[PDB]
Amino acid sequence: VQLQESGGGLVQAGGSLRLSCAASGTIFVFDKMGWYRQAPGKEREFVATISRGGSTNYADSVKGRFTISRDNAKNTVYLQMNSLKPEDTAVYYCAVRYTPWRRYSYWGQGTQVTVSSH
Amino acid sequence: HELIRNAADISVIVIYFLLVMAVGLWSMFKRSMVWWPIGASLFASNIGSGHFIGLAGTGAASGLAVGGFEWNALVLLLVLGWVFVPIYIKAGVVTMPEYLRKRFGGQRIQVYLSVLSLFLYIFTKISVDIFSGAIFINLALGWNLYLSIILLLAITALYTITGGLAAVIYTDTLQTLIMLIGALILMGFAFHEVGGYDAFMEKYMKAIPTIVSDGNTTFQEKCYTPRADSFHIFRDPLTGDLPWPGFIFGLTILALWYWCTDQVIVQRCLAAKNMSHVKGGCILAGYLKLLPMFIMVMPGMISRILFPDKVACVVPSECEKYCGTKVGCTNIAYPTLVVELMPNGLRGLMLAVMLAALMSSLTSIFNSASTLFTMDIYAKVRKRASEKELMIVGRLFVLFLVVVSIAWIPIVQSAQSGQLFDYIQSVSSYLAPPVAAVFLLAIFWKRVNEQGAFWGLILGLLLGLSRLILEFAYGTGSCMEPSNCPTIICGVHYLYFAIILFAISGIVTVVVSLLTKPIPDVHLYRLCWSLRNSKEERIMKMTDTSEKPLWRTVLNINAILLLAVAIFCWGYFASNSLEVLF
Ligand SMILES: CC(C)CCC[C@@H](C)[C@H]1CC[C@H]2[C@@H]3CC=C4C[C@@H](O)CC[C@]4(C)[C@H]3CC[C@]12C
């Protein structure tokens, strides 16, 4: 019923962090637990919609350098991002779907990651 | 009982019954039918005891799977509108056994179909409607079974002596419209109560009761859990309740028996102004037979969520005092939602319209059964027919019908693990597929004689009635205690048995018709899938299938659009399907 998330913080450029989003209080297995970031002054843009069978679908800007894998029987998505560049200074929500025709019932609270270039 | 105690709704109930009494006396003081009193009158069949009690009860027991019976009945309804009504109007006949008399030989086919239709009436319509009225009055006014039953008999005797049957166009279309609007309002109240739609999904899986421990005897967890793998349409074919091959094929042959061969369904639609009116009424009824998924099986699980103690009992010592039955009793899922989730301005209107739609479905079946008896059995045995004796034997026959139908109820209220849908289908499946097979092979194959179809019917009865007697003398039993039956004929499933009985009866009648003599083609011209114009010898209203070529076009586009919407609902509810975790 709630999407507990963690992992976000501060790191320099070129680093790598792991984003976690472990749902709780539900009985079903979720379908499309893909992450949705939000830049300040911008909307929610990118998809990482890993399916129930497991099929990643990135945006082209974060393609290749970002990976995502969930254990397919325990409802926890892990976004492992790599080679952090200073255009990723944004809050990163979680977003889930019950089913392939429901269009994102629940939502996340918000995890902000800030990357610097010192 | 407390909810309906208030005088405010009683005004609505009494003025609704005064309205139907007024239109009955207007009919008594005062065949060219339109498409809208045909569609509503076709939709209002099997409503009150197979759309409110049993359908919502099986939905509260299992889930979304029983809604597929509604779309199977939709497809067979459109098959009736396209195919079987031109066949019934080409041969110039009014029902099915008169058609078989004008197709086959002597009186034995007609009197066997009359006896079988009377036993199917007693087993599946009159007793089930009386028991559903008893559930309504018991959950509304708190009385016992027999007093509620005799109040229902008194009010339906007043309803049939008023004369509402002669104006069953206006009363049935008004009851259909009022009942559909009220059920839509109750669905909007029900989804507003649980907190949207996602809370309805999650809260239903954790909707167990709290009295699961009966001291020494403690039930397994599978009894009270709400079938946690089952929220989707197509279950497992082997060990799943309502299995998907068996569902589509068994409900196809059952709705082919019910929606095409029943003596009042086709006669309700044969009396019409034009064939295009019949097809338009069938498409309107097909649109209205699409809603009971979102109308009458989703509130069934709402009543599992809201009151998970009177709908999902496990323990008989307190379940007998809450619903009156020893085990399970999921039948009261819908009336508990009406008497608790309605304001006082509509709670009387719903219990008035869901009794008008039951009194009409009783006064139709009583008149049809009296017509069948005193025009197909007593007129064939006596063959003299002094008319005063005919009238008094019709009245004594329907009194005998009430006497047996009341006594059949304690088998019905605990027949199949509590449910009512699983009784109607389990009794229709043992006696309908022989009739469906004999009707299909009598229409299409055309090399069938009277010695084949009758013996196929008798062998189908000798298997199905044997299964029925062996079932009800033993019973399915509780989750903890398995049934004590020979399993190879007892426990495959009653849908798989319907398909097996249909195939066995078809093979037997085609073997017996291929052994003996054939039937000469020289007097089978209009009927039995042929369009010739030569005469025959054997044994204003519409006498055509014609319409304007524009109206045939718009009816064909509306029928293919209705199939598109139905296969869209099928392909939606089967594609997305929630699975639970370990
Ligand atoms: C109204 C929605 C819910 C269902 C749409 C289908 C029904 C209602 C519509 C679609 C096509 C229409 C039919 C097509 C044309 C004719 C021929 C005319 O001589 C009588 C009316 C009749 C038979 C129409 C009645 C209403 C109709 C059957």
Short mmCIF file of all heavy atoms in Angstrom, two decimals, chain B residues 35 274 276-277 279-281 283-284 287-288 551 554-555 558, ligand 1:
data_model
loop_
_atom_site.label_atom_id
_atom_site.label_comp_id
_atom_site.label_asym_id
_atom_site.label_seq_id
_atom_site.Cartn_x
_atom_site.Cartn_y
_atom_site.Cartn_z
N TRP B 35 -39.27 -3.19 -30.53
CA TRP B 35 -37.99 -3.79 -30.17
C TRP B 35 -37.62 -3.55 -28.71
O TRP B 35 -36.98 -4.41 -28.09
CB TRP B 35 -36.88 -3.26 -31.07
CG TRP B 35 -36.76 -1.77 -31.05
CD1 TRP B 35 -37.43 -0.88 -31.84
CD2 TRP B 35 -35.91 -0.99 -30.21
NE1 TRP B 35 -37.05 0.40 -31.54
CE2 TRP B 35 -36.12 0.36 -30.53
CE3 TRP B 35 -35.00 -1.31 -29.20
CZ2 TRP B 35 -35.45 1.39 -29.89
CZ3 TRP B 35 -34.33 -0.29 -28.57
CH2 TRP B 35 -34.56 1.05 -28.91
N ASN B 274 -42.16 -7.50 -36.66
CA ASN B 274 -41.30 -7.78 -37.81
C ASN B 274 -40.08 -8.54 -37.33
O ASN B 274 -39.77 -8.57 -36.14
CB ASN B 274 -40.89 -6.49 -38.52
CG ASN B 274 -40.61 -6.71 -39.99
OD1 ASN B 274 -40.90 -7.78 -40.54
ND2 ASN B 274 -40.05 -5.70 -40.64
N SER B 276 -36.98 -7.79 -38.20
CA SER B 276 -35.99 -6.79 -37.82
C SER B 276 -36.23 -6.26 -36.41
O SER B 276 -35.28 -5.91 -35.72
CB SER B 276 -35.99 -5.64 -38.83
OG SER B 276 -37.32 -5.25 -39.14
N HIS B 277 -37.49 -6.24 -35.97
CA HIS B 277 -37.79 -5.92 -34.58
C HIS B 277 -37.23 -6.97 -33.64
O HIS B 277 -36.71 -6.63 -32.57
CB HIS B 277 -39.30 -5.77 -34.39
CG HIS B 277 -39.80 -4.38 -34.58
ND1 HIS B 277 -39.91 -3.48 -33.54
CD2 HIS B 277 -40.22 -3.72 -35.68
CE1 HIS B 277 -40.39 -2.33 -34.00
NE2 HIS B 277 -40.58 -2.46 -35.30
N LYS B 279 -34.59 -8.94 -34.24
CA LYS B 279 -33.13 -8.82 -34.22
C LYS B 279 -32.67 -7.58 -33.47
O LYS B 279 -31.66 -7.63 -32.75
CB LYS B 279 -32.60 -8.82 -35.65
CG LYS B 279 -31.34 -9.64 -35.86
CD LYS B 279 -30.90 -9.64 -37.32
CE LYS B 279 -32.04 -10.05 -38.25
NZ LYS B 279 -31.61 -10.13 -39.68
N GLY B 280 -33.41 -6.47 -33.58
CA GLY B 280 -33.06 -5.28 -32.82
C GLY B 280 -33.29 -5.45 -31.33
O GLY B 280 -32.51 -4.96 -30.51
N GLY B 281 -34.37 -6.16 -30.96
CA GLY B 281 -34.58 -6.47 -29.56
C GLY B 281 -33.53 -7.42 -29.01
O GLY B 281 -33.12 -7.30 -27.86
N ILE B 283 -30.39 -7.49 -30.07
CA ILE B 283 -29.17 -6.71 -29.90
C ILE B 283 -29.28 -5.78 -28.68
O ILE B 283 -28.30 -5.60 -27.94
CB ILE B 283 -28.82 -5.96 -31.20
CG1 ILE B 283 -28.32 -6.96 -32.24
CG2 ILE B 283 -27.77 -4.88 -31.00
CD1 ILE B 283 -27.98 -6.35 -33.57
N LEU B 284 -30.47 -5.22 -28.43
CA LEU B 284 -30.66 -4.42 -27.22
C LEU B 284 -30.53 -5.26 -25.96
O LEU B 284 -29.87 -4.84 -24.99
CB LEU B 284 -32.02 -3.73 -27.26
CG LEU B 284 -32.48 -3.10 -25.94
CD1 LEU B 284 -31.70 -1.84 -25.65
CD2 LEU B 284 -33.97 -2.82 -25.96
N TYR B 287 -26.85 -5.93 -25.45
CA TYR B 287 -26.21 -4.81 -24.77
C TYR B 287 -26.52 -4.81 -23.28
O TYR B 287 -25.64 -4.52 -22.47
CB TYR B 287 -26.65 -3.49 -25.40
CG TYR B 287 -25.90 -3.10 -26.64
CD1 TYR B 287 -26.49 -2.30 -27.62
CD2 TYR B 287 -24.60 -3.54 -26.86
CE1 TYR B 287 -25.80 -1.95 -28.76
CE2 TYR B 287 -23.90 -3.19 -27.99
CZ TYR B 287 -24.51 -2.40 -28.94
OH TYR B 287 -23.82 -2.05 -30.08
N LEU B 288 -27.75 -5.14 -22.91
CA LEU B 288 -28.10 -5.15 -21.49
C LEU B 288 -27.55 -6.37 -20.76
O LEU B 288 -27.37 -6.30 -19.54
CB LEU B 288 -29.62 -5.08 -21.32
CG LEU B 288 -30.16 -3.70 -20.95
CD1 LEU B 288 -29.96 -2.72 -22.09
CD2 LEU B 288 -31.62 -3.78 -20.57
N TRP B 551 -32.10 -1.85 -43.35
CA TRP B 551 -32.23 -2.27 -41.96
C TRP B 551 -31.47 -3.56 -41.69
O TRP B 551 -30.92 -3.73 -40.60
CB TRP B 551 -33.69 -2.41 -41.56
CG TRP B 551 -34.55 -1.15 -41.65
CD1 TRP B 551 -35.78 -1.06 -42.24
CD2 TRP B 551 -34.27 0.16 -41.12
NE1 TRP B 551 -36.27 0.21 -42.13
CE2 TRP B 551 -35.37 0.98 -41.44
CE3 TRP B 551 -33.20 0.72 -40.41
CZ2 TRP B 551 -35.43 2.33 -41.09
CZ3 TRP B 551 -33.27 2.06 -40.06
CH2 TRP B 551 -34.37 2.85 -40.40
N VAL B 554 -27.87 -2.30 -41.16
CA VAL B 554 -27.56 -1.68 -39.87
C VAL B 554 -27.67 -2.71 -38.74
O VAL B 554 -26.91 -2.64 -37.76
CB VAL B 554 -28.44 -0.43 -39.62
CG1 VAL B 554 -29.91 -0.77 -39.53
CG2 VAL B 554 -27.98 0.35 -38.40
N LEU B 555 -28.53 -3.73 -38.89
CA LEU B 555 -28.58 -4.80 -37.89
C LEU B 555 -27.32 -5.66 -37.93
O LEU B 555 -26.83 -6.08 -36.88
CB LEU B 555 -29.83 -5.66 -38.09
CG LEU B 555 -31.08 -5.34 -37.27
CD1 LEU B 555 -30.80 -5.60 -35.82
CD2 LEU B 555 -31.56 -3.93 -37.43
N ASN B 558 -24.57 -3.60 -36.31
CA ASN B 558 -24.76 -3.56 -34.86
C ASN B 558 -24.43 -4.89 -34.20
O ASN B 558 -23.87 -4.91 -33.10
CB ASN B 558 -26.19 -3.15 -34.53
CG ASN B 558 -26.46 -1.69 -34.83
OD1 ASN B 558 -25.55 -0.86 -34.78
ND2 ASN B 558 -27.70 -1.37 -35.16
C1 LIG C 1 -28.93 1.74 -27.48
C2 LIG C 1 -27.67 0.91 -27.29
C3 LIG C 1 -27.40 0.67 -25.81
C4 LIG C 1 -27.76 -0.41 -28.05
C5 LIG C 1 -27.62 -0.17 -29.55
C6 LIG C 1 -28.40 -1.21 -30.35
C7 LIG C 1 -29.86 -0.80 -30.48
C8 LIG C 1 -30.32 -0.01 -29.27
C9 LIG C 1 -30.09 -0.01 -31.76
C10 LIG C 1 -28.97 -0.23 -32.77
C11 LIG C 1 -29.63 -0.43 -34.14
C12 LIG C 1 -31.09 -0.07 -33.91
C13 LIG C 1 -32.13 -0.74 -34.78
C14 LIG C 1 -31.79 -0.60 -36.26
C15 LIG C 1 -33.00 -0.16 -37.05
C16 LIG C 1 -34.22 -0.59 -36.72
C17 LIG C 1 -35.23 -0.92 -37.79
C18 LIG C 1 -36.54 -0.21 -37.47
O1 LIG C 1 -37.56 -0.67 -38.37
C19 LIG C 1 -36.95 -0.52 -36.04
C20 LIG C 1 -35.91 -0.03 -35.04
C21 LIG C 1 -34.59 -0.73 -35.27
C22 LIG C 1 -34.71 -2.21 -34.95
C23 LIG C 1 -33.48 -0.11 -34.44
C24 LIG C 1 -33.79 -0.20 -32.94
C25 LIG C 1 -32.64 0.29 -32.05
C26 LIG C 1 -31.37 -0.42 -32.47
C27 LIG C 1 -31.57 -1.93 -32.34
#
